[PDB]
Amino acid sequence: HMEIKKGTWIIKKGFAEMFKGGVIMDVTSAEQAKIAEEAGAVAVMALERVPADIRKEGGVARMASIAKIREIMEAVSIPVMAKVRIGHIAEAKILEELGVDFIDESEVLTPADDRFHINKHEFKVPFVCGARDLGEALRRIAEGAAMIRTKGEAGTGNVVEAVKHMRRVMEQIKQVTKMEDEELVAYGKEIGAPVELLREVKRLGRLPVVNFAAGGVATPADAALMMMLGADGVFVGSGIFKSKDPRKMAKAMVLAVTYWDNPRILLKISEDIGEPMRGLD
Amino acid sequence: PRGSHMEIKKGTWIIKKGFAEMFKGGVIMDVTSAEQAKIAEEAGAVAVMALERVPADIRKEGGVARMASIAKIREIMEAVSIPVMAKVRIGHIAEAKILEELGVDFIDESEVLTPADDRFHINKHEFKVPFVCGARDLGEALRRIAEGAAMIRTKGEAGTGNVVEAVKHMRRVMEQIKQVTKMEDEELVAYGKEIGAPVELLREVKRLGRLPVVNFAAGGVATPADAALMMMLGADGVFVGSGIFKSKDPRKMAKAMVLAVTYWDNPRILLKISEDIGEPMRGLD
Amino acid sequence: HMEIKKGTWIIKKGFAEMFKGGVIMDVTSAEQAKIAEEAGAVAVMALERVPADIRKEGGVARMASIAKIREIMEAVSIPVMAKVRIGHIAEAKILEELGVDFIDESEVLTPADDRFHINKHEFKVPFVCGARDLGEALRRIAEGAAMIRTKGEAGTGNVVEAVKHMRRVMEQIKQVTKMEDEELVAYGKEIGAPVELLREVKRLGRLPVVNFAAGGVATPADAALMMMLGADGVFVGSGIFKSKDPRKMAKAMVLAVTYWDNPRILLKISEDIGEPMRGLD
Amino acid sequence: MKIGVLGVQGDVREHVEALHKLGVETLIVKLPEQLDMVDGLILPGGESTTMIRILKEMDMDEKLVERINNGLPVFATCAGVILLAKRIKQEKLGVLDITVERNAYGRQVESFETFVEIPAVGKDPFRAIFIRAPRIVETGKNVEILATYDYDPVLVKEGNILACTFHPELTDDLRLHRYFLEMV
Amino acid sequence: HMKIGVLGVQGDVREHVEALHKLGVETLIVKLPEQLDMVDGLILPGGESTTMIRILKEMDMDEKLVERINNGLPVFATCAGVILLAKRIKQEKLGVLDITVERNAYGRQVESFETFVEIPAVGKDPFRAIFIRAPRIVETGKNVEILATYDYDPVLVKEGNILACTFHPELTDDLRLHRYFLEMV
Amino acid sequence: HMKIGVLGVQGDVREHVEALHKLGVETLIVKLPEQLDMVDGLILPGGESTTMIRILKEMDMDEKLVERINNGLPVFATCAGVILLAKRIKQEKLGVLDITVERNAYGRQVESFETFVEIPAVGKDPFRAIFIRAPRIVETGKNVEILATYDYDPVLVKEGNILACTFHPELTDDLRLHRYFLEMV
Incomplete structure (x- = not known):
């Protein structure tokens, strides 16, 4: 010792590296937490x-109730994450003290700052x-962010923005990978990112x-x-519990992220999944 | 003797x-009845409005928002022993004269009421x-x-349950103060023109390192x-109006507010008073 | 060993720290280099x-002739600097090989990149x-710059832009000095500067x-x-040799930078200096 | 020597700044465990009802009382007095043997400043600023009266407790603060 | 040359694959059953044990993984891997490592810590141990050899051709524990 | 307490002033003659020797600086300072340090180098010597004590209450050579 x-x-x-290849699910109850955990989720939110309800409802979206x-923390053994309004230091302090495993300063909640x-x-x-x-x-x-999530349109059932941005990020990374220092400093100004991190991306060939x-x-x-x-990996909130058979859908998501390059398996888990949320477009 | x-x-x-210095570290609560005044006072409020x-109702309702009825x-004045404040429409000298004569402890020339001037x-x-x-x-x-204002309150959006504007402005004021703190006289006079503030007060802010x-x-x-x-x-300190009585359990919420302002730098305590507070107002966004 | x-x-x-409190003079001949050195210049360009002539003349301003x-290198014992067109790697390589003591990638010369x-x-x-x-x-x-010079309008005899920018830089530094990390990252995006260097400025209370x-x-x-x-310190090019008595003016510049807070001395070195360049405005 | 300023609510800065002028070290007391870290404690101005509520909700009251009875030097201004008082004509610490009347002069518009004579600190009168001040309607057996204004005790002393109904911290007169440190 | 497999149903597969590549060995990410018969060694990475076991069963790889191991296949498990192999847990599991484990034994993620541990078997220089929501080995079996411990607890055990630790060596630049594994092949 | 002066007509005055402050001594930047009589010690910083001597003469400080030194005033010179004090130079000078120096002895700025040098007098740990367009001491006098050398050349000498070196200790975080100077006061 x-x-x-x-x-x-x-x-x-490091903690976040353990999530790779998995699915993080949004859960509203202890029952959902259990479905998510049984399905093979690597963590719950x-x-x-x-x-989707945050949209429908309206009003000011804040931190969830401690209760x-x-x-949810007591319902499963996998890590539990909680969202906080952007810039809301107090909410985050409270959450850290509560022992949550990962705080999500998300934009799906009414920004505080x-x-x-x-x-x-x-x-x-x-x-x-x-x-x-x-x-x-x-x-x-x-x-200070230890993990980034390339966002799209929360609760709409439309991957379009997610695709757009994931492609965008990956594209830029690739480019930066082949830039000379003087180009890096210049690019940094252009996309407004710290040159030190760009040099890092350039070596790792990926986000840090x-x-x-x-x-x-x-x-x-x-x-x-x-x-x-x-x-x-992917974050799935509305897409699972807003469908007909959540437990069914959930197990499929977990398997799709693992066997994304296996058509045979992708088809198998797709044979039956129920009715996906209708979505907003 | x-x-x-x-x-x-x-x-x-x-x-x-001086009177206002006594309010530091506290919470001032908006109250509509003698019953609310008492809840506020029992909770530890330093004063009621x-x-x-x-x-929030001022928004929902509409019409012309004026001074409250003397009755x-x-x-409220008779219901508690803590100071009682009353709002008056901006520029409404008469309302203020009436209030002063009534003996209110602090007049609030607020913008949440239909401006008179x-x-x-x-x-x-x-x-x-x-x-x-x-x-x-x-x-x-x-x-x-x-x-002549003896106390300033950095405002946000009244009755919306959204601290965003409050944050924006509090940061703004503090930022500027900090800057002014390190300006040279010639820069002070110039800044005064820019932000339209009296140079004399800027020189004062520069020394105190804070608002006067x-x-x-x-x-x-x-x-x-x-x-x-x-x-x-x-x-x-903070002014809380809609956020307390527009929630499920006002008395519960109220005691928590008072404690959060005191123990804002104590996560253990902030979490304790948050364990249960009821349902905060839904808010408008 | x-x-x-x-x-x-x-x-x-480090080398540049040795220049503090001094004057660097632009020189066109070996004779000027000597006047500059006798005057107390810390280095020549x-x-x-x-x-001023670069303006009057016109055409494409490039690196000086090796000759x-x-x-100038052989005429004095103080460091000798040479200018190169912005982005002109080749000119710089040549200069480094020549043994110049400090390269100046300046904008007073026709930019290459x-x-x-x-x-x-x-x-x-x-x-x-x-x-x-x-x-x-x-x-x-x-x-990679080891030394920065806050520029104004070359060869016009008007300190106005120099004042503007020197005040600007100093102002920002001062501000950054009192910013919180989250404000630093934000400011970095705003003024397009690397956050790592901002954190550095914040501690040193000055440029690095x-x-x-x-x-x-x-x-x-x-x-x-x-x-x-x-x-x-200051860089003086046209202001010295474009005046009536250069040697006279030069010795005064050197003393003004040293005794800038001594009115008695500033007045003494001003009693006679000749006729400053007319200037362009 | 380290003097504490109870900081659950009130004009804590004003007092802390006075003590610093007198060169002593200070500590803002918010938690119970901090009461055992000071040689003296100042109960500042503010709202008595607020102070007592927080004090109880944080389990500091009973320990504050004990600590005081064990001779801890205390200096109270306005709200502090009401807090320490044994009788009020409202929850309180009940240790100062006096009876007080709250808002005895009227509303805030009634607040006034006048010069009071406090022999114990010099011949020069003291600038007394009474803001929605309380009145001491009855002093006990061991309660010593150090100064009065219009028939009322405005500065009393009982044991190692020093209490006044005005705000010396709002003025630049450090005299009443020295007199307190002299009690440590 | 030898081919080491990294079970890749979920977890920090890259971290391990990169370590093995530094040691110059060839690697194969194992996702399908038929791939278990294509490797000389297998690494059960960090990640979520509950996830790993679920996928493992839903893909009919568990029973075959167990057999394959009992037939002496060299295995290296980090954190989640240990819980996966354990025979007793204070949850489904492969049940082959004769030990009893306690999950999230140190508390939540905020409790995660890094400390230097002494692993004699790999050198005098201490090893940088990074425990993230780590499990505790509360009881070791008869043939379970203890290669290193931290504060009264076995953090690195060895039973047969299985090597299991409760920390994450792959998150550091210390390839020592990985060599020691290849030495077992 | 003692007050050490840093000649500030030109040079890296800040670097030295900051070193002295780390050692807790009070400092005074010396620009005018009348200030030479207000210090217990004087540091001749790095910078341009030709500049320093020119200003020094134009302000009538040289003759008084020389006297003051001969009367035993403790002086510490780095690079330019040495050239300033030297009696012989292979250029105007104060001429009090009994040595002969060669300017720009290593070549142009591109030749500037940093190496570790051993200065027994201040400890076993080598000192980080940063030579920037440094001069070489080609000949030391009778009372000139040699405190350290690099490649056959004296890089740190001591003659009387004068301490002179050809490198820049103020550019490093090693306060050792600065203490040794204060020890001379």
Whole structure:
């Protein structure tokens, strides 16, 4: 036994590496948490109402009630994530103290700060943030984000924006990979990203943290596509519980992300899945 | 044994500015009845604001929002022992005179009420009772003070349950203050022109390193976390109107607000008072 | 004796620290180099024609002739700098090989690259670049610049732009000094500067390299002003040799930068200086 | 020597700044465990009802009382007095043997400033700023009266407790604060 | 040359594959049953044990993985892998490693820590152990050899041709524990 | 407490002032003659020797600086300082340090190098020596004590209350050579 260190970058960035190849599901109850866990979800996201309802309802979307989060924390053994309004330091402090495994400073909730985000370095618990391109993915990381999720349109059942952005990020990464330093510094100005992180992307040939696809995934095929486009995994909220047979759909999602390059299997898990959410377009 | 008994002075700047210093670290609650005043007082509120209908209802309803009825204000004045504040329409000298005569402890020339004057505000120096005004930045906070305001409240969107504007403005004011703190006189005079604020007050801000009066966060606070955030952003305290009585369990929510403003830097405690608070107002967005 | 290292950052950044409190003079001949050196200049800049003539003449302004530079290198013992067109890697390689002490990728010469600058990290010799604000000063540094010079209008005898920019840079630095990380990342996007360097500025309370005033200094008073505004020293090209008595003017400049806060002395060196260049306005 | 300023609510800054002028080190006391870290405690101005509520909700009251009875030097201004009082004509700490009347002079518009004579700190009168001040209608057996205004005790001393109904911290007169440190 | 497999139904498969490549061995990500017969060694990576077992069963790979292991196939398990192999858990499992494990034994993710541990078998220099929501080995069996421990708990065990640890060596640049595994092939 | 002066007519005055502040001593930037009588020690910083001497003469500080030094004033010179104090140079100078120096002895700026040098007098740990267009000490006098050398050349000498080196300790975080100077006061 010797000196131990907690909440360091290697631990935060590392924790997220464990999620690769998996599916993170939004859950509203302890019952859903269990379905999600039985299905093979790698983690659940605690919410009062899924993205699709957040849209339908309206009003100010804030942090979930502690009660609701404890409910879910006690219902499964897999990590539990909770969303907080952008820039809401207080909500995040509360959540960290509650012991949540991963905070999500998401935009599906009514933003608290209109310009700045939470300075995530101050925290011990890892954060995951959204991005529509390499520029903000990189900015979010500069603020401390240990995991990025390329967002689309929450709760619409349409992968189009997710595709758009996943392609965008991947495209830029690829380009940056072949830029000369002087081009890197210039590009940094263009897309408004820190040159230090660009140099990092250039060497790793990828983002310096795990990147998940999110927003609009409503069917196994959608999940597989996201992986075909280069995602490390997917976040599915409305697409599972807003369908006819959630447990059925859920097991299929988990298998599509794993066997995205296996048509035989993709077809097998698609033979029957129920009726995907109708979606908004 | 009489003791001392020399001349006394009332309604002076030290007394007005001073009275407000006593509110620091506290929560001022909007109240519509004597029953609410009592809940607010039991919860630990440092003062109550007398109204006919809270900001959220002011929005929903519509029409011309004026000064509350004297009856309603007396009701509340007699219900608690903590200071009682009353709002008046911007520029409405008469309403303010009436209120001062009524003995209210703090007049609030607020914008949540249908403005009476479209250009000028009340010349608050003429009064003995202190005034509190709104501001969206250092420029107007400073102008309001030049007119006599003894306390400023950085406003957001009244009755919407959204702290976003409050955050925006609190950050804005604090940012500017910080900057002014490191400006050279010639830069001060120039900045004054830019943000339209009196150079004399800028020189004052530059030395104190802060506003020359108490600054409270207001508008959109609907949960303990929100209140704590406002403090994290540099507020001296918060005004909460709709967020408490528009929730499921007001008394419950109220006690939490009071504690969040005090223990904003204590996660353990913030979590404790958050374990249960009921359902915050739905909010408008 | 042991292992030695050359052209490292500490050596480049360091070399420039030695210039603080001094004046760097543009020189066209070996005779001027000597006047400059006798006057107390800390270094000379080799040119075919000073900035004011560069304007008057016209055409494409390039690197000086090797002959002209050798002339000056052999004429004095103080460091000799040479200008190169922006983005002209070849000119810089040639100059480094020639042994010049400091390359100046300046904008007073017809730019060679319209978008990118020279990747200065590849070189052993230090580079000095221009900037009009903290954003580009920081970008230039990210490319390898060991010294920044806040530019104004070359060869016009008008300090106005120099003042404008020196104030601008200093203002921003001051601000950044009191920003919170989340504000730093945001500011970086705004002014297009690398967040890593902003965090550095925030701690040092100043630029991470020497910053000189340049462009339009034509009289001792002008030089003193630049120092009053926070410069580490000044570059004077046209203002000295375009005046009646260069040697006289030169000695005064050197003393103004040193005694900028001494009115008695500033007045003494101003009692007689000759006729400053007429200037263009 | 480290003096504490109870900081659950009130003009904590004003007092902290006074103590700093007197060169002593300070500590804002918010948690119970901090009461055992100071040689003296100042109960600042603010809202008595707020202070007592927080104090109880955080389980600091009973310990504050004990700590005081064990001789901890305390200085109370306005709200502090009401907080310590044994009788009020409202929850309280009940340790200062006096009876107080809240808002005895009227509403805020009634707030006034006058010069009061406090012999114990000098010949020069003290600038007393009474803001919605309380009145001490009855002093106990060991309660020593250090100054009065218009027939009313405005500055009393009982044991290691020093209480006044005005706000010295709003003025630049550090005299009443020295007199307190002299009690430590 | 030898071909080492990395079970890839879910988890930090890349981290391991990259470690093996640094050691110059050829690798194969194992997703289908028929691929278990194509490797000399198998690494059960970090990730979610519940996920791994579910996929493993739904794809009919579990029973064959067990057999294959009992027939002496060299296996290296990190965190999730251990829970997967364990015979007893204080949840479905492969049940081949004779040990009893306690999941999330140190608490939530905020409890995750990194400390230096001494693994004599691989050198004098301590190893950088990164425990992320790690499990605890509360009881080791008869043939279970203990190669290293931290605060009274076995953090690196060896039973037969199985090598299991509760931390993540693949997150560090220390290839030592990976060599030791190849040495078992 | 003692007050050390840093000659500030030109040069890296900040670097030195910051070093002295780390050692907790009070400092004064010396620009005018009358300030030479206000310090217990004086540091002649790096910069341009030709510039320093010119300003020094034009401000009538040279003759008084020389006297003041001969009367035993403790002086610490880095690079330019050495050339300034030197008695012989292979250019105007103060001429008090009994040594002969060769300017730009290693070549142009591209030749500038950093190497570790051993200065026994301040510890066993080598010192990080940064030579930038440094001069070479080609000949030391009778009372000139040699405290350290690099490749056959004295890089740190001591004669009386004068301490001179050809490199820049102020560019590093090693305060050792600066303490050794204060120890001379």
